[PDB]
UniProtKB/Swiss-Prot annotation, chains A, B:
PANTHER family: OXYGEN-INSENSITIVE NADPH NITROREDUCTASE (PTHR43425:SF2). This is NADPH-flavin oxidoreductase. It catalyses: FMNH2 + NADP(+) = FMN + NADPH + 2 H(+). Homodimer. FMN binds at residues 10-14, 38, 66-68, 127-130, 166-168. InterPro entries: Flavin_OxRdtase_Frp, Nitroreductase, Nitroreductase-like. The keyword Zinc does not apply. GO terms for molecular function: FMN reductase (NADPH) activity. The keyword Oxidoreductase applies. It comes from Vibrio harveyi. The gene is frp. Catalyzes the NADPH-dependent reduction of FMN to FMNH(2). Involved in bioluminescence by providing FMNH(2) to luciferase. Pfam families: Nitroreductase (PF00881).
Amino acid sequence: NNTIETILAHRSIRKFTAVPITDEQRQTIIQAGLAASSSSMLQVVSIVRVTDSEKRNELAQFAGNQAYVESAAEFLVFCIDYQRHATINPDVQADFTELTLIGAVDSGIMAQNCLLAAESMGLGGVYIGGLRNSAAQVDELLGLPENSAVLFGMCLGHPDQNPEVKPRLPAHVVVHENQYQELNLDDIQSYDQTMQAYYSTWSQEVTGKLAGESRPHILPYLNSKGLAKR
Amino acid sequence: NNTIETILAHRSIRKFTAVPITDEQRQTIIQAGLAASSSSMLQVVSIVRVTDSEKRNELAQFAGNQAYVESAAEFLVFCIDYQRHATINPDVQADFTELTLIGAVDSGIMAQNCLLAAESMGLGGVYIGGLRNSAAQVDELLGLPENSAVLFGMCLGHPDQNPEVKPRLPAHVVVHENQYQELNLDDIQSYDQTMQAYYSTWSQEVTGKLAGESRPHILPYLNSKGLAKR
Ligand SMILES: NC(=O)c1ccc[n+]([C@@H]2O[C@H](COP(=O)([O-])OP(=O)(O)OC[C@H]3O[C@@H](n4cnc5c(N)ncnc54)[C@H](O)[C@@H]3O)[C@@H](O)[C@H]2O)c1
Ligand SMILES: Cc1cc2nc3c(=O)[nH]c(=O)nc-3n(C[C@@H](O)[C@H](O)[C@@H](O)COP(=O)(O)O)c2cc1C
Ligand SMILES: Cc1cc2nc3c(=O)[nH]c(=O)nc-3n(C[C@@H](O)[C@H](O)[C@@H](O)COP(=O)(O)O)c2cc1C
Protein backbone atom coordinates (compact mmCIF):
# COMPACT_ATOMS: atom_id res chain seq x y z
CA ASN A 1 0.00 0.00 0.00
CA ASN A 2 0.88 3.71 -0.25
CA THR A 3 1.40 4.09 3.51
CA ILE A 4 4.17 1.48 3.68
CA GLU A 5 5.67 2.74 0.41
CA THR A 6 5.92 6.25 1.88
CA ILE A 7 7.50 4.95 5.12
CA LEU A 8 10.14 2.90 3.29
CA ALA A 9 10.95 5.70 0.83
CA HIS A 10 12.14 8.03 3.61
CA ARG A 11 15.39 10.00 3.56
CA SER A 12 16.19 13.28 5.32
CA ILE A 13 15.99 16.29 3.00
CA ARG A 14 18.38 19.15 3.81
CA LYS A 15 17.91 21.39 0.75
CA PHE A 16 14.61 23.05 -0.14
CA THR A 17 13.17 25.31 -2.84
CA ALA A 18 11.37 28.59 -2.09
CA VAL A 19 7.92 27.16 -2.92
CA PRO A 20 5.71 27.54 0.19
CA ILE A 21 3.48 24.93 1.82
CA THR A 22 -0.24 25.69 1.46
CA ASP A 23 -2.51 26.42 4.43
CA GLU A 24 -4.45 23.25 3.62
CA GLN A 25 -1.30 21.11 3.61
CA ARG A 26 -0.02 22.58 6.88
CA GLN A 27 -3.39 22.15 8.60
CA THR A 28 -3.44 18.52 7.44
CA ILE A 29 0.12 17.96 8.68
CA ILE A 30 -0.89 19.30 12.11
CA GLN A 31 -4.11 17.22 12.23
CA ALA A 32 -2.04 14.13 11.38
CA GLY A 33 0.19 14.88 14.36
CA LEU A 34 -2.81 15.34 16.66
CA ALA A 35 -4.26 11.97 15.58
CA ALA A 36 -1.26 10.26 17.22
CA SER A 37 -1.60 8.15 20.38
CA SER A 38 -1.14 9.94 23.71
CA SER A 39 -0.07 8.39 27.03
CA SER A 40 -3.11 8.38 29.33
CA MET A 41 -4.59 10.97 26.95
CA LEU A 42 -2.43 13.52 28.79
CA GLN A 43 -1.62 15.40 25.56
CA VAL A 44 1.70 16.80 26.80
CA VAL A 45 3.15 17.99 23.48
CA SER A 46 3.20 21.58 22.24
CA ILE A 47 4.30 22.74 18.80
CA VAL A 48 5.82 26.15 18.16
CA ARG A 49 5.53 27.17 14.50
CA VAL A 50 8.23 29.73 13.68
CA THR A 51 7.26 32.09 10.85
CA ASP A 52 9.28 35.11 12.01
CA SER A 53 12.35 35.36 9.73
CA GLU A 54 14.60 36.81 12.45
CA LYS A 55 13.78 34.04 14.92
CA ARG A 56 14.42 31.52 12.12
CA ASN A 57 17.90 32.98 11.62
CA GLU A 58 18.61 32.76 15.36
CA LEU A 59 17.30 29.17 15.50
CA ALA A 60 19.47 28.16 12.53
CA GLN A 61 22.45 29.42 14.57
CA PHE A 62 21.25 27.77 17.79
CA ALA A 63 20.98 24.51 15.85
CA GLY A 64 24.68 24.68 15.00
CA ASN A 65 24.41 26.86 11.88
CA GLN A 66 22.22 24.40 9.99
CA ALA A 67 21.14 26.53 7.01
CA TYR A 68 18.08 24.44 6.13
CA VAL A 69 16.40 25.66 9.33
CA GLU A 70 16.10 29.10 7.73
CA SER A 71 15.48 27.97 4.14
CA ALA A 72 12.76 25.44 5.04
CA ALA A 73 9.20 26.42 4.08
CA GLU A 74 8.10 25.50 7.61
CA PHE A 75 9.92 25.00 10.92
CA LEU A 76 8.15 23.33 13.84
CA VAL A 77 9.54 23.05 17.36
CA PHE A 78 8.33 20.15 19.51
CA CYS A 79 8.19 20.76 23.25
CA ILE A 80 7.22 18.93 26.43
CA ASP A 81 4.30 20.83 27.96
CA TYR A 82 2.97 20.32 31.47
CA GLN A 83 2.20 24.02 31.84
CA ARG A 84 -1.27 23.48 30.35
CA HIS A 85 -1.94 21.03 33.17
CA ALA A 86 -0.33 23.33 35.74
CA THR A 87 -2.58 26.20 34.62
CA ILE A 88 -5.69 24.02 35.01
CA ASN A 89 -4.61 22.63 38.39
CA PRO A 90 -1.69 24.21 40.34
CA ASP A 91 -1.30 21.03 42.43
CA VAL A 92 0.19 19.17 39.45
CA GLN A 93 3.56 17.56 40.18
CA ALA A 94 5.45 17.62 36.87
CA ASP A 95 9.00 17.01 38.14
CA PHE A 96 8.94 13.19 38.07
CA THR A 97 11.29 11.78 35.40
CA GLU A 98 8.40 9.54 34.30
CA LEU A 99 6.67 12.62 32.88
CA THR A 100 9.77 13.71 30.95
CA LEU A 101 9.93 10.21 29.42
CA ILE A 102 6.27 10.52 28.42
CA GLY A 103 6.92 13.94 26.91
CA ALA A 104 9.85 12.56 24.92
CA VAL A 105 8.13 9.38 23.70
CA ASP A 106 4.83 11.11 22.85
CA SER A 107 6.69 13.90 21.00
CA GLY A 108 8.51 11.39 18.80
CA ILE A 109 5.22 9.64 18.02
CA MET A 110 3.45 12.91 17.11
CA ALA A 111 6.37 14.30 15.09
CA GLN A 112 6.61 11.11 13.02
CA ASN A 113 2.93 11.43 12.08
CA CYS A 114 3.58 15.01 10.94
CA LEU A 115 6.63 13.97 8.91
CA LEU A 116 4.89 11.02 7.25
CA ALA A 117 1.89 13.20 6.38
CA ALA A 118 4.25 15.71 4.77
CA GLU A 119 6.21 13.04 2.90
CA SER A 120 3.03 11.46 1.51
CA MET A 121 2.25 14.85 -0.06
CA GLY A 122 5.61 14.95 -1.81
CA LEU A 123 7.23 17.22 0.78
CA GLY A 124 10.62 16.63 2.34
CA GLY A 125 11.91 17.10 5.86
CA VAL A 126 14.44 16.47 8.61
CA TYR A 127 14.43 16.40 12.43
CA ILE A 128 16.62 19.00 14.14
CA GLY A 129 17.99 17.81 17.48
CA GLY A 130 20.82 20.35 17.35
CA LEU A 131 18.60 22.85 19.18
CA ARG A 132 19.33 20.97 22.42
CA ASN A 133 22.99 22.03 22.41
CA SER A 134 21.70 25.60 22.94
CA ALA A 135 18.63 24.55 24.95
CA ALA A 136 18.50 27.49 27.39
CA GLN A 137 18.82 30.06 24.59
CA VAL A 138 16.19 28.37 22.39
CA ASP A 139 13.90 28.05 25.41
CA GLU A 140 14.08 31.79 26.15
CA LEU A 141 13.70 32.76 22.47
CA LEU A 142 10.40 30.87 22.22
CA GLY A 143 9.31 32.08 25.66
CA LEU A 144 8.71 28.61 27.11
CA PRO A 145 7.23 28.78 30.66
CA GLU A 146 7.91 26.53 33.65
CA ASN A 147 7.12 22.81 33.23
CA SER A 148 7.98 23.10 29.53
CA ALA A 149 11.14 22.22 27.60
CA VAL A 150 12.45 22.04 24.04
CA LEU A 151 13.26 18.64 22.52
CA PHE A 152 13.74 19.08 18.77
CA GLY A 153 12.71 20.99 15.67
CA MET A 154 11.63 19.90 12.20
CA CYS A 155 12.23 21.35 8.74
CA LEU A 156 9.50 20.88 6.12
CA GLY A 157 9.40 21.95 2.48
CA HIS A 158 9.69 21.02 -1.19
CA PRO A 159 12.87 18.98 -1.93
CA ASP A 160 15.78 20.43 -3.90
CA GLN A 161 17.89 17.26 -3.68
CA ASN A 162 17.34 13.51 -4.03
CA PRO A 163 19.53 11.51 -1.59
CA GLU A 164 19.71 7.71 -1.66
CA VAL A 165 18.02 5.68 1.08
CA LYS A 166 20.42 5.03 3.99
CA PRO A 167 20.69 1.37 5.10
CA ARG A 168 19.96 0.45 8.73
CA LEU A 169 21.25 -2.35 10.95
CA PRO A 170 19.62 -5.64 9.88
CA ALA A 171 16.41 -6.79 11.60
CA HIS A 172 18.12 -9.77 13.27
CA VAL A 173 20.40 -7.37 15.18
CA VAL A 174 17.67 -4.95 16.30
CA VAL A 175 14.93 -7.50 17.05
CA HIS A 176 15.33 -10.00 19.91
CA GLU A 177 13.16 -13.09 20.46
CA ASN A 178 11.85 -13.38 24.05
CA GLN A 179 15.22 -12.49 25.58
CA TYR A 180 18.02 -10.02 24.85
CA GLN A 181 20.67 -11.71 22.68
CA GLU A 182 24.41 -11.01 22.73
CA LEU A 183 25.78 -8.90 19.88
CA ASN A 184 27.63 -10.68 17.08
CA LEU A 185 30.46 -8.35 16.03
CA ASP A 186 30.48 -9.99 12.58
CA ASP A 187 27.12 -8.30 11.91
CA ILE A 188 28.59 -4.89 12.79
CA GLN A 189 31.54 -5.47 10.44
CA SER A 190 29.13 -6.35 7.62
CA TYR A 191 27.15 -3.18 8.35
CA ASP A 192 30.30 -1.04 8.33
CA GLN A 193 31.14 -2.45 4.90
CA THR A 194 27.59 -1.68 3.74
CA MET A 195 27.82 1.91 5.00
CA GLN A 196 31.26 2.39 3.43
CA ALA A 197 29.77 1.51 0.03
CA TYR A 198 27.02 4.07 0.67
CA TYR A 199 29.57 6.81 1.36
CA SER A 200 36.12 6.24 9.27
CA THR A 201 33.53 3.46 9.65
CA TRP A 202 30.04 3.74 11.18
CA SER A 203 30.89 1.83 14.38
CA GLN A 204 34.05 3.90 14.88
CA GLU A 205 32.14 7.16 14.32
CA VAL A 206 29.14 6.54 16.61
CA THR A 207 31.13 4.97 19.47
CA GLY A 208 33.84 7.61 19.20
CA LYS A 209 31.16 10.23 19.69
CA LEU A 210 29.78 8.48 22.77
CA ALA A 211 33.29 8.03 24.21
CA GLY A 212 33.22 11.72 25.10
CA GLU A 213 30.64 13.85 26.90
CA SER A 214 27.09 14.06 25.53
CA ARG A 215 25.65 17.54 26.17
CA PRO A 216 26.21 17.63 29.98
CA HIS A 217 24.04 20.76 30.28
CA ILE A 218 20.83 18.85 29.47
CA LEU A 219 19.86 17.63 32.97
CA PRO A 220 20.56 21.08 34.54
CA TYR A 221 18.42 22.61 31.77
CA LEU A 222 15.49 20.24 32.37
CA ASN A 223 15.76 20.85 36.12
CA SER A 224 15.75 24.63 35.57
CA LYS A 225 12.36 24.19 33.88
CA GLY A 226 11.14 22.07 36.79
CA LEU A 227 11.43 18.73 34.99
CA ALA A 228 13.16 15.42 35.78
CA LYS A 229 14.13 16.41 39.33
CA ARG A 230 13.32 12.98 40.81
CA ASN B 1 -4.01 10.10 0.05
CA ASN B 2 -3.97 6.68 1.74
CA THR B 3 -1.19 7.51 4.23
CA ILE B 4 -3.07 10.49 5.66
CA GLU B 5 -6.33 8.50 5.68
CA THR B 6 -4.68 5.74 7.73
CA ILE B 7 -3.19 8.26 10.18
CA LEU B 8 -6.52 10.02 10.78
CA ALA B 9 -8.48 6.76 11.17
CA HIS B 10 -6.43 5.73 14.21
CA ARG B 11 -7.98 4.40 17.41
CA SER B 12 -6.39 2.12 20.01
CA ILE B 13 -7.56 -1.48 19.69
CA ARG B 14 -7.76 -3.51 22.92
CA LYS B 15 -9.67 -6.56 21.68
CA PHE B 16 -8.19 -8.99 19.15
CA THR B 17 -9.22 -12.17 17.32
CA ALA B 18 -7.19 -15.39 17.47
CA VAL B 19 -6.01 -14.93 13.86
CA PRO B 20 -2.18 -14.64 13.84
CA ILE B 21 -0.04 -12.12 11.97
CA THR B 22 1.80 -13.76 9.04
CA ASP B 23 5.60 -13.72 8.78
CA GLU B 24 5.42 -11.46 5.70
CA GLN B 25 3.32 -8.90 7.59
CA ARG B 26 5.55 -8.96 10.68
CA GLN B 27 8.72 -8.54 8.60
CA THR B 28 7.18 -5.54 6.80
CA ILE B 29 6.10 -3.97 10.11
CA ILE B 30 9.68 -4.31 11.41
CA GLN B 31 11.14 -2.95 8.15
CA ALA B 32 8.82 0.06 8.45
CA GLY B 33 10.13 0.74 11.95
CA LEU B 34 13.75 0.50 10.80
CA ALA B 35 13.06 3.07 8.06
CA ALA B 36 12.49 5.70 10.78
CA SER B 37 14.89 8.62 11.31
CA SER B 38 17.69 8.04 13.82
CA SER B 39 19.46 10.66 15.97
CA SER B 40 23.03 10.98 14.65
CA MET B 41 22.43 7.55 13.09
CA LEU B 42 23.13 6.10 16.55
CA GLN B 43 20.38 3.47 16.19
CA VAL B 44 19.79 3.13 19.94
CA VAL B 45 16.54 1.16 19.82
CA SER B 46 16.02 -2.56 20.38
CA ILE B 47 12.78 -4.51 20.05
CA VAL B 48 12.00 -7.63 22.07
CA ARG B 49 9.35 -9.79 20.39
CA VAL B 50 7.60 -11.89 23.04
CA THR B 51 6.32 -15.21 21.69
CA ASP B 52 6.67 -17.11 24.99
CA SER B 53 3.12 -17.51 26.35
CA GLU B 54 4.34 -17.82 29.96
CA LYS B 55 6.21 -14.52 29.62
CA ARG B 56 3.18 -12.88 27.99
CA ASN B 57 1.06 -13.76 31.01
CA GLU B 58 3.63 -12.29 33.41
CA LEU B 59 3.95 -9.14 31.28
CA ALA B 60 0.15 -8.78 31.29
CA GLN B 61 0.19 -8.82 35.10
CA PHE B 62 3.24 -6.52 35.26
CA ALA B 63 1.43 -4.09 32.95
CA GLY B 64 -1.44 -3.77 35.43
CA ASN B 65 -3.53 -6.79 34.43
CA GLN B 66 -4.12 -5.58 30.87
CA ALA B 67 -5.54 -8.75 29.28
CA TYR B 68 -4.92 -7.67 25.67
CA VAL B 69 -1.17 -8.02 26.32
CA GLU B 70 -1.71 -11.79 26.38
CA SER B 71 -4.42 -12.02 23.68
CA ALA B 72 -2.59 -9.87 21.10
CA ALA B 73 -1.12 -11.72 18.11
CA GLU B 74 2.19 -9.90 18.57
CA PHE B 75 3.66 -8.08 21.56
CA LEU B 76 6.72 -5.91 20.88
CA VAL B 77 8.76 -4.33 23.67
CA PHE B 78 10.68 -1.16 22.80
CA CYS B 79 13.92 -0.57 24.71
CA ILE B 80 16.70 2.02 24.90
CA ASP B 81 19.91 0.24 23.87
CA TYR B 82 23.44 1.56 24.35
CA GLN B 83 24.82 -1.92 25.09
CA ARG B 84 25.48 -2.55 21.39
CA HIS B 85 27.75 0.51 21.45
CA ALA B 86 29.33 -0.54 24.76
CA THR B 87 30.14 -3.97 23.27
CA ILE B 88 31.89 -2.35 20.28
CA ASN B 89 33.73 0.21 22.42
CA PRO B 90 33.94 -0.15 26.25
CA ASP B 91 34.86 3.58 26.59
CA VAL B 92 31.32 4.58 25.71
CA GLN B 93 29.69 6.84 28.30
CA ALA B 94 25.96 6.11 28.23
CA ASP B 95 24.86 7.70 31.53
CA PHE B 96 24.17 11.23 30.23
CA THR B 97 20.49 12.24 30.38
CA GLU B 98 20.80 13.51 26.79
CA LEU B 99 21.26 9.90 25.69
CA THR B 100 18.08 8.82 27.51
CA LEU B 101 16.14 11.61 25.77
CA ILE B 102 17.49 10.40 22.42
CA GLY B 103 16.44 6.85 23.26
CA ALA B 104 12.92 7.88 24.26
CA VAL B 105 12.36 10.15 21.25
CA ASP B 106 13.81 7.71 18.71
CA SER B 107 11.77 4.86 20.21
CA GLY B 108 8.54 6.79 19.76
CA ILE B 109 9.42 7.59 16.14
CA MET B 110 10.23 3.95 15.31
CA ALA B 111 7.22 2.54 17.18
CA GLN B 112 4.81 4.86 15.36
CA ASN B 113 6.13 3.67 12.00
CA CYS B 114 5.47 0.10 13.18
CA LEU B 115 1.91 0.91 14.27
CA LEU B 116 1.00 2.85 11.11
CA ALA B 117 2.41 0.06 8.95
CA ALA B 118 0.20 -2.42 10.83
CA GLU B 119 -2.88 -0.15 10.71
CA SER B 120 -2.48 0.29 6.94
CA MET B 121 -2.72 -3.51 6.62
CA GLY B 122 -6.08 -3.57 8.39
CA LEU B 123 -4.54 -4.56 11.72
CA GLY B 124 -4.98 -2.81 15.04
CA GLY B 125 -2.81 -2.01 18.01
CA VAL B 126 -2.20 -0.15 21.24
CA TYR B 127 0.89 1.15 23.05
CA ILE B 128 1.51 -0.37 26.47
CA GLY B 129 3.20 2.07 28.83
CA GLY B 130 1.85 0.01 31.73
CA LEU B 131 5.02 -2.11 31.60
CA ARG B 132 6.72 0.70 33.51
CA ASN B 133 4.57 -0.12 36.58
CA SER B 134 7.03 -2.96 37.23
CA ALA B 135 9.97 -1.75 35.11
CA ALA B 136 12.64 -3.58 37.14
CA GLN B 137 10.78 -6.90 37.00
CA VAL B 138 10.02 -6.57 33.27
CA ASP B 139 13.72 -5.79 32.71
CA GLU B 140 14.92 -8.94 34.50
CA LEU B 141 12.30 -11.07 32.72
CA LEU B 142 13.58 -9.94 29.31
CA GLY B 143 17.20 -10.20 30.43
CA LEU B 144 18.16 -6.65 29.47
CA PRO B 145 21.87 -5.85 30.08
CA GLU B 146 23.55 -2.69 31.37
CA ASN B 147 23.01 0.49 29.30
CA SER B 148 19.62 -0.89 28.25
CA ALA B 149 16.13 -0.17 29.61
CA VAL B 150 12.45 -0.85 28.87
CA LEU B 151 10.19 2.03 27.78
CA PHE B 152 6.90 0.57 26.52
CA GLY B 153 5.27 -2.34 24.73
CA MET B 154 2.91 -2.64 21.78
CA CYS B 155 0.01 -5.01 21.12
CA LEU B 156 -0.72 -5.85 17.48
CA GLY B 157 -3.31 -8.08 15.84
CA HIS B 158 -6.66 -8.34 14.08
CA PRO B 159 -9.32 -6.03 15.62
CA ASP B 160 -12.37 -7.46 17.40
CA GLN B 161 -13.93 -4.08 18.18
CA ASN B 162 -14.64 -0.82 16.35
CA PRO B 163 -14.13 2.19 18.67
CA GLU B 164 -14.96 5.72 17.54
CA VAL B 165 -12.08 8.14 16.91
CA LYS B 166 -11.22 10.23 20.00
CA PRO B 167 -11.07 14.02 19.59
CA ARG B 168 -7.91 15.88 20.64
CA LEU B 169 -7.37 19.43 21.87
CA PRO B 170 -7.91 21.90 18.99
CA ALA B 171 -4.90 22.87 16.86
CA HIS B 172 -4.98 26.50 18.07
CA VAL B 173 -4.32 25.30 21.63
CA VAL B 174 -1.52 22.85 20.78
CA VAL B 175 0.17 24.95 18.08
CA HIS B 176 1.85 28.24 19.03
CA GLU B 177 2.91 30.92 16.56
CA ASN B 178 6.51 32.09 17.11
CA GLN B 179 6.16 32.24 20.89
CA TYR B 180 4.38 30.31 23.63
CA GLN B 181 0.83 31.60 24.09
CA GLU B 182 -1.12 31.69 27.36
CA LEU B 183 -3.87 29.10 27.82
CA ASN B 184 -7.50 30.19 27.50
CA LEU B 185 -9.42 28.10 30.05
CA ASP B 186 -12.56 28.49 27.92
CA ASP B 187 -10.97 26.22 25.30
CA ILE B 188 -10.34 23.55 27.95
CA GLN B 189 -13.98 23.73 29.06
CA SER B 190 -15.09 23.41 25.43
CA TYR B 191 -12.85 20.36 25.02
CA ASP B 192 -14.23 18.83 28.24
CA GLN B 193 -17.77 19.15 26.86
CA THR B 194 -16.63 17.56 23.59
CA MET B 195 -15.16 14.63 25.54
CA GLN B 196 -18.29 14.26 27.67
CA ALA B 197 -20.29 14.03 24.43
CA TYR B 198 -17.89 11.31 23.25
CA TYR B 199 -18.48 9.29 26.43
CA SER B 200 -15.70 13.81 35.95
CA THR B 201 -14.16 15.69 33.00
CA TRP B 202 -10.97 15.13 30.99
CA SER B 203 -9.16 18.09 32.55
CA GLN B 204 -10.22 16.96 36.02
CA GLU B 205 -9.12 13.38 35.32
CA VAL B 206 -5.68 14.10 33.80
CA THR B 207 -4.69 16.80 36.32
CA GLY B 208 -5.98 14.63 39.16
CA LYS B 209 -3.54 11.93 38.09
CA LEU B 210 -0.70 14.44 37.83
CA ALA B 211 -1.56 15.82 41.29
CA GLY B 212 -0.34 12.51 42.69
CA GLU B 213 3.00 10.76 42.18
CA SER B 214 3.87 9.55 38.67
CA ARG B 215 5.80 6.24 38.84
CA PRO B 216 8.47 7.55 41.31
CA HIS B 217 10.53 4.37 40.82
CA ILE B 218 11.42 5.25 37.21
CA LEU B 219 14.55 7.37 37.74
CA PRO B 220 16.05 4.83 40.19
CA TYR B 221 15.30 2.11 37.62
CA LEU B 222 17.06 4.04 34.84
CA ASN B 223 20.01 4.65 37.18
CA SER B 224 20.24 0.95 38.10
CA LYS B 225 20.80 0.23 34.40
CA GLY B 226 23.47 2.94 34.14
CA LEU B 227 21.26 5.54 32.45
CA ALA B 228 20.27 9.15 33.25
CA LYS B 229 22.78 9.49 36.10
CA ARG B 230 24.02 12.97 35.12
N1 LIG C 1 -11.40 2.64 34.84
C1 LIG C 1 -10.31 3.11 35.45
O1 LIG C 1 -10.32 3.50 36.62
C2 LIG C 1 -9.04 3.20 34.59
C3 LIG C 1 -7.83 3.66 35.13
C4 LIG C 1 -6.71 3.81 34.32
C5 LIG C 1 -6.78 3.50 32.95
N2 LIG C 1 -7.98 3.03 32.38
C6 LIG C 1 -8.07 2.54 30.97
O2 LIG C 1 -6.84 1.91 30.58
C7 LIG C 1 -6.39 2.49 29.34
C8 LIG C 1 -5.50 3.68 29.63
O3 LIG C 1 -4.12 3.42 29.39
P1 LIG C 1 -3.11 4.63 29.69
O4 LIG C 1 -2.81 5.29 28.41
O5 LIG C 1 -3.61 5.41 30.84
O6 LIG C 1 -1.82 3.79 30.11
P2 LIG C 1 -1.14 3.26 31.46
O7 LIG C 1 0.30 3.11 31.18
O8 LIG C 1 -1.58 4.16 32.55
O9 LIG C 1 -1.78 1.76 31.68
C9 LIG C 1 -3.10 1.55 32.22
C10 LIG C 1 -3.03 1.56 33.74
O10 LIG C 1 -4.32 1.75 34.34
C11 LIG C 1 -4.69 0.58 35.11
N3 LIG C 1 -6.09 0.17 34.80
C12 LIG C 1 -7.13 0.21 35.64
N4 LIG C 1 -8.26 -0.16 35.02
C13 LIG C 1 -7.86 -0.42 33.78
C14 LIG C 1 -8.67 -0.95 32.79
N5 LIG C 1 -9.98 -1.15 32.93
N6 LIG C 1 -8.06 -1.29 31.63
C15 LIG C 1 -6.74 -1.11 31.47
N7 LIG C 1 -5.98 -0.59 32.43
C16 LIG C 1 -6.53 -0.24 33.62
C17 LIG C 1 -3.71 -0.50 34.72
O11 LIG C 1 -3.47 -1.36 35.84
C18 LIG C 1 -2.47 0.27 34.31
O12 LIG C 1 -1.65 0.57 35.44
C19 LIG C 1 -7.63 3.05 28.68
O13 LIG C 1 -8.38 2.07 27.95
C20 LIG C 1 -8.36 3.59 29.89
O14 LIG C 1 -9.74 3.72 29.54
C21 LIG C 1 -9.10 2.89 33.23
C1 LIG D 1 15.25 13.33 16.85
C2 LIG D 1 16.28 13.41 15.71
C3 LIG D 1 17.11 14.51 15.61
C4 LIG D 1 17.89 14.68 14.50
N1 LIG D 1 18.62 15.83 14.41
C5 LIG D 1 19.31 16.08 13.24
C6 LIG D 1 19.90 17.39 13.16
O1 LIG D 1 20.03 18.23 14.06
N2 LIG D 1 20.37 17.73 11.89
C7 LIG D 1 20.36 16.91 10.78
O2 LIG D 1 20.86 17.23 9.71
N3 LIG D 1 19.78 15.67 10.99
C8 LIG D 1 19.25 15.16 12.17
N4 LIG D 1 18.62 13.94 12.32
C9 LIG D 1 18.28 13.25 11.21
C10 LIG D 1 19.37 12.40 10.55
O3 LIG D 1 20.67 12.42 11.15
C11 LIG D 1 18.88 11.07 10.00
O4 LIG D 1 17.71 10.51 10.62
C12 LIG D 1 19.90 10.05 9.47
O5 LIG D 1 21.14 9.86 10.10
C13 LIG D 1 19.32 8.79 8.92
O6 LIG D 1 19.10 9.16 7.56
P1 LIG D 1 17.68 9.38 6.88
O7 LIG D 1 16.85 10.12 7.85
O8 LIG D 1 18.04 10.15 5.67
O9 LIG D 1 17.26 7.99 6.65
C14 LIG D 1 17.89 13.73 13.48
C15 LIG D 1 17.12 12.59 13.62
C16 LIG D 1 16.31 12.43 14.71
C17 LIG D 1 15.45 11.19 14.80
C1 LIG E 1 3.49 5.51 24.86
C2 LIG E 1 1.99 5.27 25.16
C3 LIG E 1 1.64 4.40 26.17
C4 LIG E 1 0.33 4.06 26.33
N1 LIG E 1 0.05 3.09 27.25
C5 LIG E 1 -1.21 2.53 27.24
C6 LIG E 1 -1.38 1.39 28.13
O1 LIG E 1 -0.56 0.91 28.91
N2 LIG E 1 -2.64 0.81 28.09
C7 LIG E 1 -3.68 1.20 27.26
O2 LIG E 1 -4.75 0.61 27.24
N3 LIG E 1 -3.41 2.31 26.47
C8 LIG E 1 -2.22 3.02 26.39
N4 LIG E 1 -1.96 4.11 25.56
C9 LIG E 1 -2.80 4.34 24.54
C10 LIG E 1 -4.06 5.15 24.88
O3 LIG E 1 -4.08 5.71 26.17
C11 LIG E 1 -4.54 6.09 23.79
O4 LIG E 1 -3.53 6.74 23.01
C12 LIG E 1 -5.74 6.99 24.11
O5 LIG E 1 -5.92 7.51 25.42
C13 LIG E 1 -6.04 7.98 23.03
O6 LIG E 1 -6.94 7.29 22.19
P1 LIG E 1 -6.64 6.62 20.78
O7 LIG E 1 -5.24 6.13 20.83
O8 LIG E 1 -7.67 5.56 20.76
O9 LIG E 1 -6.85 7.74 19.85
C14 LIG E 1 -0.66 4.60 25.52
C15 LIG E 1 -0.31 5.53 24.56
C16 LIG E 1 1.01 5.86 24.37
C17 LIG E 1 1.35 6.95 23.35
